[PDB]
Amino acid sequence: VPEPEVVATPPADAGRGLIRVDSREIRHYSGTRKEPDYLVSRDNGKTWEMKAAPAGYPPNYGGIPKESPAIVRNPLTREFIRVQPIGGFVFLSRGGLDGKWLAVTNDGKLEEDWKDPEKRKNLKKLGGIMRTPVFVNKGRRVIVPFHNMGGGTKFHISDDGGLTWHVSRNGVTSPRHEARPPHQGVRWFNNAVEATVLEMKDGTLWALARTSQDQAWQAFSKDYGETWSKPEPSRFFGTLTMNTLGRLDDGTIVSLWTNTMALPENATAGNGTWEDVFTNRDSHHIAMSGDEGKTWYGFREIILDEHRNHPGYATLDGPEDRGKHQSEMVQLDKNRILISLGQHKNHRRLVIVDRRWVGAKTRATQTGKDLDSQWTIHTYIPQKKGHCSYNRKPSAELVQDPSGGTKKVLQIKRLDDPELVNEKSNVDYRNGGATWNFPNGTTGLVKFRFRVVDGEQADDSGLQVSLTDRLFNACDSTTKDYALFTFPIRLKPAPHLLLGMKKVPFTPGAWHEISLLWQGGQAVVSLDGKKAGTLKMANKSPNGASYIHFISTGSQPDAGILLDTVNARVKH
Ligand SMILES: [Cl-]
Ligand SMILES: [Cl-]
Ligand SMILES: [Mg+2]
Numbered sequence: 001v002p003e004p005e006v007v008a009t010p011p012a013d014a015g016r017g018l019i020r021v022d023s024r025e026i027r028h029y030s031g032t033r034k035e036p037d038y039l040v041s042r043d044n045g046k047t048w049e050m051k052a053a054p055a056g057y058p059p060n061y062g063g064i065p066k067e068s069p070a071i072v073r074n075p076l077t078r079e080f081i082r083v084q085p086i087g088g089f090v091f092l093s094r095g096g097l098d099g100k101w102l103a104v105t106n107d108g109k110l111e112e113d114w115k116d117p118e119k120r121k122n123l124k125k126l127g128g129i130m131r132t133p134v135f136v137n138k139g140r141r142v143i144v145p146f147h148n149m150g151g152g153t154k155f156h157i158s159d160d161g162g163l164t165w166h167v168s169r170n171g172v173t174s175p176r177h178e179a180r181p182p183h184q185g186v187r188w189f190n191n192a193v194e195a196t197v198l199e200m201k202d203g204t205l206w207a208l209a210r211t212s213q214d215q216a217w218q219a220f221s222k223d224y225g226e227t228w229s230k231p232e233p234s235r236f237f238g239t240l241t242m243n244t245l246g247r248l249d250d251g252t253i254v255s256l257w258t259n260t261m262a263l264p265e266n267a268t269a270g271n272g273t274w275e276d277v278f279t280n281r282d283s284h285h286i287a288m289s290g291d292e293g294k295t296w297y298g299f300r301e302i303i304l305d306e307h308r309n310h311p312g313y314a315t316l317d318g319p320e321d322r323g324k325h326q327s328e329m330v331q332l333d334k335n336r337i338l339i340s341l342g343q344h345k346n347h348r349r350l351v352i353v354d355r356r357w358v359g360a361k362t363r364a365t366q367t368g369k370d371l372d373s374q375w376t377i378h379t380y381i382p383q384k385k386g387h388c389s390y391n392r393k394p395s396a397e398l399v400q401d402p403s404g405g406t407k408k409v410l411q412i413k414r415l416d417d418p419e420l421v422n423e424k425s426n427v428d429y430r431n432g433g434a435t436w437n438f439p440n441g442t443t444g445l446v447k448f449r450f451r452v453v454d455g456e457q458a459d460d461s462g463l464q465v466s467l468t469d470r471l472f473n474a475c476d477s478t479t480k481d482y483a484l485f486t487f488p489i490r491l492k493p494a495p496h497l498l499l500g501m502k503k504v505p506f507t508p509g510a511w512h513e514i515s516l517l518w519q520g521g522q523a524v525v526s527l528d529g530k531k532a533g534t535l536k537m538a539n540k541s542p543n544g545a546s547y548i549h550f551i552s553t554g555s556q557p558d559a560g561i562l563l564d565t566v567n568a569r570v571k572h
Pocket of ligand 1: 059060061062063084087088089090
């Protein structure tokens with residue numbers, strides 16, 4: 001069961017430009033304003049190197065330096081079409097990527113002499129911000145999702161292989177976010193943008209779009225993209241982040257997205273016409289369906305941003321946008337998939353993922369050994385830095401096992417740090433916390449081992465433990481309101497679990513194990529092998545649980561609790 005492996009850094013932010021050339025060669029093009037180039041693997045995605053593009057490959061007339069054009073293979077002709085993320089022209093290939101490239105004109109002909117500035121004025125220019133062209137209807141139609149400023153997603157449609165184009169009648173829209181508590185302001189408004197499109201086996205098109213809601217929104221088309229159903233929430237959580245859909249050779253559907261919940265909007269968020277800060281872009285997730293979208297499995301973290309705890313995160317190597325969001329995939333073989341993900345040269349990666357890992361049923365961790373690669377523990381310094389970023393601090397730290405062992409364990413407590421406070425924005429991120437991903441399940445058993453730290457505790461000191469269906473920030477105290485199951489561990493007057501109104505004591509200065517066995521709308525809580533009580537489901541979930549979330553509850557600085565091991569098994 002092989003773990004995801006990082007194999008290279010793509011030469012552009014992920015989302016466009018990754019393309020299989022043949023059985024062993026894969027290329028990732030770049031958005032360079034200079035002579036075109038690409039990163040190439042000649043061993044089916046394991047090793048990579050830069051290479052300059054041949055003289056016939058057109059430069060990037062449109063687009064932007066951080067993003068490559070989209071290159072898609074026409075399934076009938078095996079030639080390629082190239083479209084920029086913004087501006088520029090439509091190029092069709094003749095003789096493959098290294099052959100002859102022709103530009104589409106406004107009349108619908110192919111222009112061979114595009115190096116001439118005078119001949120580029122008559123070239124077709126598709127408007128809006130575009131994503132990946134998709135060939136549908138047995139390869140006879142190509143559609144390109146685009147979104148302008150404001151109107152939502154629509155589709156450029158061509159039944160001529162890219163020669164002539166029209167626009168869909170309608171598209172995908174999504175509603176504005178409403179400032180209601182826990183929010184103190186409105187999220188930046190995105191009207192169903194940057195859509196990904198997948199053709200279903202029965203001919204229906206499924207569009208999945210990025211919104212200002214808690215999840216991507218979706219719409220369906222029964223006419224190959226000409227008209228679309230009323231938009232509705234999808235099952236893929238995530239705000240203001242991109243989705244990507246793909247299909248493996250055997251028909252399995254793959255979903256890639258950032259399965260996160262952003263911090264609630266603060267008191268200075270704005271009117272929704274601009275973004276103040278991104279707090280949900282430090283991971284990427286994968287889910288698969290073997291039955292045409294009926295049921296999904298996985299929902300696993302592909303990768304966590306390696307710099308996510310850094311106090312200079314927002315400004316390391318310039319201020320531009322960064323993170324693990326945005327993605328594109330290429331199947332390597334029956335069991336393995338290559339994924340390009342992320343933004344900014346320090347964060348974007350090429351990753352190989354295995355199906356058998358996506359379908360695994362168990363996961364175990366020890367905080368001292370796995371903190372860096374598996375645990376989300378960062379809190380934010382709530383001061384705007386760079387472009388819509390916050391610098392970070394680890395909200396929890398590893399300490400020596402108080403029993404005298406060699407283990408390091410994670411101390412989770414209310415911090416004393418004035419940098420974690422912004423009075424005007426009215427946010428306080430001083431509650432330490434930690435969260436960990438495991439394979440999705442509507443039934444499961446999670447066990448964790450914990451201990452009360454010896455020292456002074458505040459009156460409300462303790463831990464809120466939550467099972468959630470997406471990644472909540474380690475310092476998000478409202479997680480319990482969205483959790484599938486949640487309960488507090490309270491340290492005062494004496495340590496006890498609170499299950500509804502039943503108090504279940506446990507001793508200080510000793511390691512204890514809690515297990516949660518959930519099935520349908522109930523979870524049975526056990527303490528040291530003995531049943532302690534049952535929890536009713538707090539929130540229905542379309543998918544099931546895939547995260548456990550721990551956060552301190554103290555309102556004053558305190559010693560808190562220690563967290564050692566977590567073990568999860570799903571699908572009983
Ligand atoms: Cl171009
Ligand atoms: Cl700055
Ligand atoms: Mg905002």
